[PDB]
């Protein structure tokens, strides 16, 4: 029994490698040779929003792109107004430990969860001028690492027990569970169409999941260590990942194989976030050296460096308009660059 | 600015005033962290995530223990770690040593001091006085070690020494370990109190430029 299974798996893996190595006729860096480069860009910090008394672990821009959430380890969530640097709301959490945060696309709800395995949902626009809990979604086994809002009634969550789930908020129980990962799931990214989503774990492999059917579609493996962040090209046909090998990579969907790798000899620290620009040319990245870099996504040549913090950077976010970029840090201060 | 903007600025000021008070009240307590594998009795030292809370001489302590490389970055501002190990099993002592070595040489805990607690010394006494199981079977170097019934003292000194040896191999002098031989013992809070006081004292000496 076992012998046939092992032999069949090995034969299929070899078959898959042989098939995907028949398409790569030309690399990317050989096609975009005659392209005018970007040059040098310089961004000066335009604002700094202070008021937290501990480290910052999460952040998310509003659909309007004028407001934002931020969750700290002191047990409090603050909603800021970027233009006037004013605090619209202050929310105190039941559990001090928190590792994620999200802002609903309409603007009526926020959500958060952490080292207690529960994802709690808060409602913003009510009578009485209060901010009170609506639901407490439970049923996971390990901590939660990331959660993204789908509608005003659906969520997708990634836990630390090697599984992802799709919740319907009103009833309170899961409707779909995605399995097949062998390590903790650290990052989750949605698609602009909201019909597929990609996930990244600690066994150095990312996967492409379907939402309605509920079954894995493709698996990509090109890294040497665990993965800590993931994004999606604005077109919806490519995504960039970042790991503990101090290197980034750009995988493709239709061609099925990796395209390019971004790495420098001087940098050896792991990455903690990643993001694109509105057009898709720049690629931001945040390291543990207390600074961020900017990569030209079609040439792999550095273009600029932002260094306004003292401790490592936890989250990086870009607005829908693309007017500004906000980066969080452990020095309790998150700035806004333009 | 119009009238609405001044009213919104007033609201922001009040929010901030509340945040400051909450911060100071939070700043008046001392937090810890508890670690122990199994068959060690972590819950019987002071007799998703559980937590306790105690006090001694008008100081407030908080404990945290879950039921591990990835969530350990959250606890890098606590004052001290607690590590509870068993002392009657000879089969798994190597596993406890490897676990201690992995915690001591981590990357985010490079300045957090450890407290040890070697449990169940009376079971060690009975198991070594019976003579059925010998330490020389599992540890070869025990035959030559001589102490600096005398048998119980020799054995327990050997077991304590190997942990302290793991501790002093490469620490750089920024943090240290504080062994203990805990039995039904009822004075487990005074010891933690004294060791935390000493930890903060070394910190204050380091800040005032004397060292």
């Amino acid at each position, epitope marked *: 029994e076992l012998d046939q299974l092992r032999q069949e798996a090995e034969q299929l893996k070899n078959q898959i490698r042989d098939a995907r190595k028949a398409c790569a006729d030309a690399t990317l860096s050989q096609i975009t040779n005659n392209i005018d480069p970007v040059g040098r860009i310089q961004m000066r910090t335009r604002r700094t929003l202070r008021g937290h008394l501990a480290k910052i672990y999460a952040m998310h821009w509003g659909t309007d792109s004028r407001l934002l959430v931020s969750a700290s380890q002191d047990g409090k969530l603050i909603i800021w*107004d970027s233009y006037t640097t*004013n605090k619209v709301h202050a929310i105190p959490l039941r559990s001090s430990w928190v590792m994620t945060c999200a802002y609903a696309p309409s603007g009526n709800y926020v959500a958060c969860g952490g080292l207690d395995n529960i994802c709690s949902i808060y409602n913003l626009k009510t009578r009485e*001028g*209060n901010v009170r809990v609506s639901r407490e979604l439970a049923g996971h086994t390990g901590y939660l690492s990331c959660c993204r809002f789908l509608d005003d009634n659906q969520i997708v969550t990634s836990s630390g027990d090697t599984t992802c789930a799709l919740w319907d908020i009103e009833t309170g129980q899961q409707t779909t569970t995605f399995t097949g990962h062998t390590g903790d799931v650290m990052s989750l990214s949605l698609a602009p169409d909201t019909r597929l989503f990609v996930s990244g774990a600690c066994d150095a492999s990312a996967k492409l999941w379907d939402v309605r059917e509920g079954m894995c579609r493709q698996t990509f493996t090109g890294h040497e260590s665990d993965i800590n962040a993931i994004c999606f090209f604005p077109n919806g046909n490519a995504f960039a990942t970042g790991s503990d090998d101090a290197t980034c990579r750009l995988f493709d969907l239709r061609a099925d194989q990796e395209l390019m790798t971004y790495s420098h000899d001087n940098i050896i620290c792991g990455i903690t976030s990643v993001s694109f620009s509105k057009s898709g040319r720049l690629l931001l990245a945040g390291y543990d050296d207390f600074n961020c870099n900017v990569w030209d996504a079609l040439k792999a040549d550095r273009a600029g460096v932002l260094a306004g913090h003292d401790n490592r950077v936890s989250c990086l976010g870009v607005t829908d308009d693309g007017m500004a970029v906000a980066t969080g840090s452990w020095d309790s201060f998150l700035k806004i660059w333009n | 600015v119009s*009238a*609405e903007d001044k*009213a*919104a600025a*007033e609201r922001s000021k009040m929010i901030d005033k509340n945040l400051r008070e909450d911060g100071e009240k939070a700043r008046r307590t001392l937090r810890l962290l508890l670690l122990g594998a199994d068959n060690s009795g972590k819950s019987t030292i002071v007799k998703g995530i559980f937590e306790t809370k105690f006090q001694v001489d008008k100081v407030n302590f908080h404990m945290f223990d879950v039921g591990r490389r990835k969530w350990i970055q959250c606890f890098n501002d606590v004052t001290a770690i607690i590590f509870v190990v068993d002392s009657s099993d000879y089969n798994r002592l190597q596993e406890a040593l490897n676990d201690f070595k992995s915690i001591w040489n981590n990357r985010w805990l490079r300045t957090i001091s450890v407290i040890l607690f070697l449990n169940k010394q009376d079971l060690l006494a009975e198991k070594v006085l019976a003579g059925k199981s010998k330490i020389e079977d599992y540890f070869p170097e025990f035959a030559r070690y001589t102490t600096p019934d005398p048998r119980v003292t020799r054995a327990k000194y050997f077991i304590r020494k190997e942990f302290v040896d793991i501790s002093t191999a490469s620490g750089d002098g920024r943090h240290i370990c504080y062994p203990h031989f805990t039995c039904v013992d009822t004075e487990n809070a005074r010891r933690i109190f004294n060791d935390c006081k000493d930890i903060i004292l070394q910190m204050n000496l380091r800040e005032y430029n004397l060292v």
Partner: single-chain antibody
Amino acid sequence: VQLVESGGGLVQPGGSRKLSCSASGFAFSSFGMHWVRQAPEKGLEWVAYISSGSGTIYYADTVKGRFTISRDDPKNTLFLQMTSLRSEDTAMYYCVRSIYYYGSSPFDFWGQGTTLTVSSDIVMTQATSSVPVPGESVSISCRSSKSLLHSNGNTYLYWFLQRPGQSPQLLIYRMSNLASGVPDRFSGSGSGTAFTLTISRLEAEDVGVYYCMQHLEYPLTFGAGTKLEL
């Protein structure tokens, strides 16, 4: 939410009276109270405003120096103290609550009024007083003394509709947005110094008086008002 006002009655001239309002079902501390009085043959006129936490106090020129406003957070009550009364103070006083933050809507709830009978400025005027009109669209226009459009791009104009023998309710805030619990048929359009309110598919119980109020700067001044009849 419930707002209740206790006080009023016949008072001799030069007498001192106290009006107490108690609010329940919402957080009193966050909101900032307002005082509005309506004359028997005249439109609503602003009287006094108290900021949340008692940080800022503003008074009308007419009642300045003889009226004191105070509030107690624990008792959840609002008090107005009047001294040295005159003959032209016979009116009805309504308790109003407003909260200020980005995207918030002020003057959402109006408390029940009481009766008290004794024994420069932006000028906003509406040309139409009475309009005769179901199933036919109606248009109401309110003129302004000066442009209400600020540097930020926000124009402050408020439309209030009062049914016969009932407290007025907010319909449109900032001349575009629609208040919660209000039907979609009502619409608001505007330009600097000219504002028009258009209602379509008019039905029964929509008859009432409409007032345009500018919140650009203190003191707030209400419009003359327009009366709708079948």
